[PDB]
Protein backbone atom coordinates (compact mmCIF):
# COMPACT_ATOMS: atom_id res chain seq x y z
CA UNK A 1 0.00 0.00 0.00
CA UNK A 2 2.31 2.69 -1.35
CA UNK A 3 1.91 6.18 -2.76
CA UNK A 4 2.33 6.79 -6.49
CA UNK A 5 5.54 8.50 -7.60
CA UNK A 6 6.08 9.94 -11.07
CA UNK A 7 8.24 7.87 -13.40
CA UNK A 8 7.04 4.45 -12.19
CA UNK A 9 5.24 1.56 -13.86
CA UNK A 10 1.59 1.01 -12.97
CA UNK A 11 -0.64 -2.06 -13.24
CA UNK A 12 -4.21 -1.01 -14.03
CA UNK A 13 -6.87 -3.56 -13.09
CA UNK A 14 -10.45 -3.16 -14.27
CA UNK A 15 -12.79 -3.19 -11.29
CA UNK A 16 -15.76 -4.95 -12.90
CA UNK A 17 -13.98 -7.47 -15.11
CA UNK A 18 -10.94 -8.08 -12.93
CA UNK A 19 -8.69 -8.12 -16.01
CA UNK A 20 -5.86 -5.70 -16.78
CA UNK A 21 -5.45 -2.85 -19.24
CA UNK A 22 -2.86 -3.56 -21.93
CA UNK A 23 -1.72 -2.84 -25.46
CA UNK A 24 -3.14 -5.42 -27.86
CA UNK A 25 -0.42 -5.06 -30.55
CA UNK A 26 -3.20 -5.90 -33.01
CA UNK A 27 -4.76 -2.86 -34.64
CA UNK A 28 -7.79 -1.95 -36.71
CA UNK A 29 -5.30 -0.43 -39.19
CA UNK A 30 -7.51 2.67 -39.08
CA UNK A 31 -5.82 5.79 -40.48
CA UNK A 32 -2.65 5.16 -38.43
CA UNK A 33 0.25 3.11 -39.78
CA UNK A 34 1.80 2.29 -36.41
CA UNK A 35 -1.22 2.13 -34.09
CA UNK A 36 -1.73 -0.60 -31.51
CA UNK B 1 17.35 -8.48 -25.72
CA UNK B 2 13.87 -6.99 -25.54
CA UNK B 3 14.93 -3.51 -26.63
CA UNK B 4 16.43 -4.75 -29.91
CA UNK B 5 13.29 -6.78 -30.65
CA UNK B 6 11.19 -3.69 -29.94
CA UNK B 7 13.31 -1.58 -32.31
CA UNK B 8 13.05 -4.19 -35.07
CA UNK B 9 9.28 -4.42 -34.60
CA UNK B 10 9.01 -0.62 -34.79
CA UNK B 11 11.06 -0.58 -38.00
CA UNK B 12 8.97 -3.37 -39.54
CA UNK B 13 5.77 -1.51 -38.67
CA UNK B 14 7.20 1.68 -40.20
CA UNK B 15 8.21 0.00 -43.47
CA UNK B 16 6.07 -2.83 -44.90
CA UNK B 17 7.81 -5.64 -46.77
CA UNK B 18 5.68 -5.13 -49.88
CA UNK B 19 6.85 -1.55 -50.40
CA UNK B 20 10.50 -2.63 -50.34
CA UNK B 21 9.71 -5.51 -52.69
CA UNK B 22 8.08 -3.11 -55.13
CA UNK B 23 10.89 -0.55 -55.02
CA UNK B 24 13.34 -3.38 -55.69
CA UNK B 25 11.10 -4.53 -58.55
CA UNK B 26 11.34 -1.09 -60.17
CA UNK B 27 13.94 -1.05 -62.96
CA UNK B 28 16.07 1.60 -64.66
CA UNK B 29 16.25 2.83 -68.26
CA UNK B 30 19.18 1.46 -70.28
CA UNK B 31 21.28 3.83 -72.41
CA UNK B 32 21.19 2.85 -76.07
CA UNK B 33 23.09 3.62 -79.26
CA UNK B 34 21.62 5.39 -82.28
CA UNK B 35 22.63 4.94 -85.90
CA UNK B 36 25.61 7.20 -85.52
CA UNK B 37 27.72 5.28 -83.02
CA UNK B 38 26.91 7.85 -80.32
CA UNK B 39 25.31 6.15 -77.33
CA UNK B 40 22.56 8.31 -75.87
CA UNK B 41 23.07 8.72 -72.13
CA UNK B 42 20.12 9.30 -69.78
CA UNK B 43 21.26 11.92 -67.30
CA UNK B 44 22.80 10.07 -64.36
CA UNK B 45 22.44 13.19 -62.20
CA UNK B 46 18.71 12.61 -62.69
CA UNK B 47 16.60 9.48 -62.94
CA UNK B 48 16.53 6.34 -60.82
CA UNK C 1 32.05 2.76 -70.68
CA UNK C 2 28.71 4.30 -69.68
CA UNK C 3 28.68 5.61 -66.11
CA UNK C 4 25.38 3.91 -65.29
CA UNK C 5 26.92 0.53 -66.14
CA UNK C 6 29.73 1.18 -63.66
CA UNK C 7 27.20 2.25 -61.02
CA UNK C 8 25.14 -0.89 -61.66
CA UNK C 9 28.21 -3.12 -61.36
CA UNK C 10 29.08 -1.37 -58.10
CA UNK C 11 25.54 -1.83 -56.75
CA UNK C 12 25.35 -5.50 -57.71
CA UNK C 13 28.80 -6.49 -56.44
CA UNK C 14 28.33 -4.53 -53.20
CA UNK C 15 24.77 -5.54 -52.27
CA UNK C 16 23.20 -8.32 -54.34
CA UNK C 17 26.04 -10.83 -54.55
CA UNK C 18 27.06 -10.57 -50.85
CA UNK C 19 23.43 -11.11 -49.84
CA UNK C 20 23.08 -14.15 -52.11
CA UNK C 21 26.37 -15.47 -50.69
CA UNK C 22 25.22 -15.04 -47.08
CA UNK C 23 21.87 -16.68 -47.95
CA UNK C 24 23.59 -19.57 -49.73
CA UNK C 25 22.42 -22.39 -47.38
CA UNK C 26 18.80 -21.48 -48.15
CA UNK C 27 19.42 -22.58 -51.78
CA UNK C 28 19.17 -26.29 -50.81
CA UNK C 29 15.91 -27.43 -52.41
CA UNK C 30 14.82 -25.76 -55.66
CA UNK C 31 13.73 -28.64 -57.91
CA UNK C 32 10.53 -27.13 -59.29
CA UNK C 33 12.29 -23.76 -59.72
CA UNK C 34 14.91 -24.87 -62.26
CA UNK C 35 14.31 -22.25 -64.95
CA UNK C 36 15.01 -19.26 -62.71
CA UNK C 37 18.10 -20.77 -61.07
CA UNK C 38 19.61 -21.74 -64.42
CA UNK C 39 19.03 -18.14 -65.53
CA UNK C 40 20.68 -16.85 -62.35
CA UNK C 41 23.75 -19.04 -62.88
CA UNK C 42 24.10 -18.04 -66.53
CA UNK C 43 23.69 -14.32 -65.81
CA UNK C 44 26.28 -14.52 -63.03
CA UNK C 45 28.69 -16.32 -65.36
CA UNK C 46 28.18 -13.71 -68.09
CA UNK C 47 28.73 -10.92 -65.57
CA UNK C 48 31.96 -12.64 -64.49
H or E segment and range at residue C42: helix C34-47
Q: Which chains touch B (3 or more CB pairs under 8 A)?
A: A, C
List of chain C residues whose C-beta atoms are within 8 Å of the C-beta of residue B41: 2-4
- Tally of helices (H runs) and strands (E runs) in chain A: 0, 0
Cβ B17 vs Cβ B36: under 8 Å: no
Name chain B contacts of C7, Cβ cutoff 8 Å: 44
Nearest residue in A to B14, CA atom: A34
**Which residues have C-beta within 8 Å of that of residue C47, sequence separation ≥ 6?**
C12
Instruction: Count how many Cα atoms sit within 13 Å of the Cα of residue B37 in the half-sphere of its side chain.
Output: 0
Q: DSSP letter at B39?
A: E
CB B14 within 8 A of CB A34: yes
Q: Determined by which method?
A: cryo-EM
- CA gap B13, B16 in Å, rounded: 6
Give the three-state DSSP class for B47: coil
Resolution (A): 3.3
Amino acid sequence: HRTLLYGHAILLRHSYSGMYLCCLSTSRSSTDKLAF
Amino acid sequence: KGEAIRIRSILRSLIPLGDLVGVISIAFQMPTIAKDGNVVEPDMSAGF
Amino acid sequence: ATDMALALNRYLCTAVLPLLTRCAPLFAGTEHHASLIDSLLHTVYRLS
